[PDB]
Amino acid sequence: ALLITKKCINCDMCEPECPNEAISMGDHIYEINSDKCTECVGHYETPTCQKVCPIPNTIVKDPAHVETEEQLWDKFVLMHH
Ligand code: SF4
Ligand code: SF4
């Protein structure tokens, strides 16, 4: 799953887009919920928030290492048959 890094400049571009509504605003910058991010696997060939992002601030994150079939299985449990 992805993370948004401190360069985020709070443009909201990325929130209406995420197919699994895992992005929200909070304390200082937009935040991605680890639990709900499939890195867009089952919806887009490329992670839709990196796509909209004007700055390139969204990165894979290291304390939330997922293999592609665990991303996949998140997508199927979320959206399902
Ligand atoms: S990579 Fe996809 S699922 Fe994850 S926060 Fe971005 S738009 Fe959402
Ligand atoms: S699109 Fe990029 S700069 Fe704008 S809020 Fe989302 S992560 Fe931050």
Domain ranges of the chain: 1-81
From the CB of 58, is ligand 2 less than 6 Å away?
A: yes
Per-residue buried b or exposed e for 56-76, using 16+ beta carbons within 10 Å of the residue's own CB: ebbeebeeeebeeeebeebbe
Give how far Cα 44 sits from Cα of 10, 27, 36, 40, 74, Å: 23, 29, 15, 6, 14
C-alpha span between 3 and 30 (Å, rounded): 9
Solving technique? X-ray
Contact 54, 11 (CB under 8 A): yes
> Which ligand lies nearest the alpha carbon of 23?
1
* Resolution of the model in angstroms: 1.6
CB atoms within 10 A of CB 1: 21
| 1-81: CATH architecture | 2-Layer Sandwich (3.30)
| 22 alpha carbon – ligand 1 mean position (Å) | 7
Q: Can you spell out the DSSP letters for 10-52?
A: ---TTTTT-TT--EE--SSS-EE-GGG--TTTTT-SS-HHHHH
CA-proximal residue: ligand 2, atom 1 (nearest): 53
